[PDB]
Amino acid sequence: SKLPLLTENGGRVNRVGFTRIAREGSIHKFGFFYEFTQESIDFDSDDGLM
């Protein structure tokens, strides 16, 4: 019932349209840290602690 049929006289028949879509995404921020003292390094048994 929706086939674009055409007669020998043509005319303004079977017009169509188009569409488009948009996608999006965003970034975020992360981080963490730790703290220490000089003694916690110098007097510790393991010299490879850091």
Binding site: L6, E8, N9, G10, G11, R12
Partner: protein, 50 residues
């Protein structure tokens, strides 16, 4: 005589017929006469046999 002919195709493709399925041919002209000496035009009116 002025003759204008457009055959079906891109020549006749417009907003009213996007497919250009029809053509046409036309003829036109101008005509007129000036009677300078009407008395030199002689006419007899009569009936004619079957």
């Amino acid at each position: 005589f002025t003759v204008m002919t457009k055959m079906p195709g891109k020549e006749t493709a417009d907003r009213n017929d996007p497919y250009g399925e029809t053509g046409f041919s036309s003829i036109k002209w101008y005509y007129g006469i000036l009677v300078k000496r009407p008395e030199r035009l002689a006419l007899i009116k009569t009936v004619a046999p079957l």
